[PDB]
Design an enzyme around this catalytic site. Structure first.
Site, PDB file in Angstrom:
ATOM      1  N   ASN A   1       5.736   0.594   7.042  1.00  0.00           N
ATOM      2  CA  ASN A   1       4.785   0.105   8.036  1.00  0.00           C
ATOM      3  C   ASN A   1       3.913  -0.997   7.468  1.00  0.00           C
ATOM      4  OD1 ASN A   1       1.648   0.868   7.810  1.00  0.00           O
ATOM      5  ND2 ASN A   1       2.801   2.527   6.803  1.00  0.00           N
TER       6      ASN A   1
ATOM      7  N   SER B   1      -4.576   0.703   0.885  1.00  0.00           N
ATOM      8  CA  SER B   1      -3.649   0.120   1.846  1.00  0.00           C
ATOM      9  C   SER B   1      -2.962  -1.097   1.242  1.00  0.00           C
ATOM     10  CB  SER B   1      -4.334  -0.291   3.140  1.00  0.00           C
ATOM     11  OG  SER B   1      -3.422  -1.045   3.926  1.00  0.00           O
TER      12      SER B   1
ATOM     13  N   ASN C   1      -1.492  -3.223   3.025  1.00  0.00           N
ATOM     14  CA  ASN C   1      -1.378  -4.165   4.147  1.00  0.00           C
ATOM     15  C   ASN C   1      -2.645  -4.947   4.487  1.00  0.00           C
ATOM     16  OD1 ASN C   1       1.334  -3.276   4.443  1.00  0.00           O
ATOM     17  ND2 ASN C   1       0.574  -1.473   5.572  1.00  0.00           N
ATOM     18  N   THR C   2      -3.624  -4.883   3.596  1.00  0.00           N
ATOM     19  CA  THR C   2      -4.794  -5.741   3.703  1.00  0.00           C
ATOM     20  C   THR C   2      -4.927  -6.500   2.393  1.00  0.00           C
ATOM     21  OG1 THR C   2      -5.983  -4.360   5.301  1.00  0.00           O
ATOM     22  CG2 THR C   2      -7.293  -5.836   3.935  1.00  0.00           C
TER      23      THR C   2
ATOM     24  N   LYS D   1      -8.957   7.411  -1.862  1.00  0.00           N
ATOM     25  CA  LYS D   1      -7.518   7.500  -1.663  1.00  0.00           C
ATOM     26  C   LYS D   1      -6.872   6.365  -2.428  1.00  0.00           C
ATOM     27  CE  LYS D   1      -3.901   7.937   1.905  1.00  0.00           C
ATOM     28  NZ  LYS D   1      -3.657   8.241   3.364  1.00  0.00           N
TER      29      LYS D   1
ATOM     30  N   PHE E   1      -4.310  -2.065   9.513  1.00  0.00           N
ATOM     31  CA  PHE E   1      -5.590  -1.525   9.982  1.00  0.00           C
ATOM     32  C   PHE E   1      -5.889  -1.913  11.432  1.00  0.00           C
ATOM     33  CE2 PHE E   1      -7.948  -1.249   5.578  1.00  0.00           C
ATOM     34  CZ  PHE E   1      -7.299  -0.041   5.319  1.00  0.00           C
TER      35      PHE E   1
ATOM     36  N   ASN F   1      -1.383   7.055  -1.083  1.00  0.00           N
ATOM     37  CA  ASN F   1      -1.000   6.199   0.004  1.00  0.00           C
ATOM     38  C   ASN F   1       0.481   5.825  -0.128  1.00  0.00           C
ATOM     39  OD1 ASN F   1      -1.422   4.242   2.292  1.00  0.00           O
ATOM     40  ND2 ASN F   1      -3.502   4.189   1.616  1.00  0.00           N
TER      41      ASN F   1
END
Ligand SMILES: Cc1cc2nc3c(=O)[nH]c(=O)nc-3n(C[C@H](O)[C@H](O)[C@H](O)COP(=O)(O)O)c2cc1C
Ligand SMILES: O=C(O)c1ccccc1/C=N/Nc1nc(-c2ccccc2Cl)cs1
Ligand SMILES: O=C(O)c1cc(=O)[nH]c(=O)[nH]1
Length: 365
Positions: A114, A184, A186-187, A224, A118, A253
């Site tokens: 994925n 994450s 994805n940032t 996390k 966010f 994660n």
């Protein structure tokens, strides 16, 4: 078990054949929030109860962040049999996240990739949503069903620490625990918050905001982390966590790595990989963080859990609680009762009085 097989062999494959992963996810969130769920007939045994983070959890199996990003399905998730629910990640301002498509199935690997980025309704909307059921949650919590809130940061924010602080102030009073998500994939820039001097600065500010909350509205704070950390990263995190008195760690994660052996056609899509290929990388990270913190820092273990064995391995490695997400997308809701039922059986087979006795057992062999 009859519906375990039906969901696993027939229902889930059919929904997957009809719907792309994001559509299936949105639909699942809608169904869950309406209570349209099978019989979670499994009754939690006392063996499964865990006391940690200032709370009783009637079972150690939670739903990971990312399924209910906006706090819409909390009650439906308890009805599914999860012993605790984590919503998020929530960013201070609303934001759309990445362009579609941004979620991919790897059926041959029992994995998902994925890059949501966010997508979030934002703090204010989630705050009002949680406020509307605040007293019902207070009873759930007292009844052993706590709520965690996972905090993210906006894509365009210049001060990351202020984004998290804002989350602590707005959603902290509504949460049993908060999660500072610095992992994450994805940032852009987010994971560098895991480095030592920057993490110390960030967490100091976070904990200060948390400590400024009134006593009954004061949540535990967890960090996390990624499964892709160097040994140096892990040592530093352990050190900072102990220096500041961070309450716990969520491990882990999704991974930006692509382990050898992936068969899925979509294996080279950008994003975080979850599910089975993540499982042991995650378990090994739990094992390392538990040893580095001397078994004194509660760990929520997550990554590739789809059975009682998977859960117990993470517990024996040092997790006090576990979460799952990706397993639910392949097996459906029956997987929750399955994991609990198998976990209990395995605990008895291995001579543990309960989950608590198993926590970190591998380190005492
Ligand atoms: C589609 C998707 C969205 C996710 N979104 C978040 C998120 O917003 N915040 C977060 O901390 N973790 C998020 N995660 C990570 C999960 O919480 C969990 O750490 C990871 O998927 C490993 O667990 P699993 O193998 O059981 O899926 C997401 C995972 C998936 C698959
Ligand atoms: O389809 C995917 O690949 C996917 C990928 C990411 C996140 C969610 C999903 C979809 N998950 N689908 C789910 N369905 C259920 C479900 C299935 C049947 C009945 C009730 C429910 Cl809540 C729970 S999660
Ligand atoms: O929103 C995301 O895309 C997301 C966040 C996160 O923490 N983990 C993940 O795998 N994806």
């Amino acid at each position: 078990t009859g519906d375990e097989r039906f969901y696993a062999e027939h229902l889930m494959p059919t929904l997957q054949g009809l719907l792309d992963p994001e559509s299936a996810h949105r639909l699942a969130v809608r169904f869950t929030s309406l209570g349209l769920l099978p019989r979670a007939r499994f009754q939690d045994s006392d063996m499964l109860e865990v006391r940690v983070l200032g709370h009783k959890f009637r079972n150690p199996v939670g739903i990971a962040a990312g399924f209910d990003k906006h706090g819409e399905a909390v009650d439906g998730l308890y009805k599914m049999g999860f012993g605790f629910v984590e919503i998020g990640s929530v960013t201070p301002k609303p934001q759309e996240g990445n362009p579609r498509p941004r979620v991919f199935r790897l059926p041959e690997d029992q994995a998902v990739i994925n890059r949501y980025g966010f997508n979030s309704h934002g703090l204010s909307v989630v705050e009002h949503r949680l406020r509307a059921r605040q007293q019902k949650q207070a009873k759930l919590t007292e009844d052993g069903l706590p709520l965690g809130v996972n905090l993210g940061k906006n894509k365009t924010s210049v001060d990351a620490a202020e984004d998290y602080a804002e989350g602590v102030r707005v959603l902290g009073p509504l949460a049993d625990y908060l999660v500072v998500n610095v992992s994450s994939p994805n940032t852009a820039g987010l994971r560098s918050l895991q480095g030592k001097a920057e993490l110390r600065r960030l967490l100091t500010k976070v904990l200060q905001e948390r400590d400024g909350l009134r006593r009954v509205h004061r949540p535990a704070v967890l960090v996390k982390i990624a499964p892709d950390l160097t040994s140096q990263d892990k040592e530093d995190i352990a050190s900072v966590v102990k220096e500041l008195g961070i309450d716990g760690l969520i491990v882990t994660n999704t991974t930006v790595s692509r382990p050898a052996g992936l068969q899925g056609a979509l294996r080279s899509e950008t994003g975080g990989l979850s599910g089975k290929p993540l499982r042991d990388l995650s378990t090994q990270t739990i094992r390392e963080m538990y040893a580095l913190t001397q078994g004194r820092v509660p760990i929520i273990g997550v990554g590739g859990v789809s059975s009682g064995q998977d859960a117990l391995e993470k517990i024996r490695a040092g997790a006090s609680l576990v979460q799952l997400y990706t397993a639910l997308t392949f097996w459906g809701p029956p997987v929750v009762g399955k994991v609990k039922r198998e976990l209990e059986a395995l605990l008895k087979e291995q001579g543990f009085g309960g989950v608590t006795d198993a926590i970190g057992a591998d380190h005492r062999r």
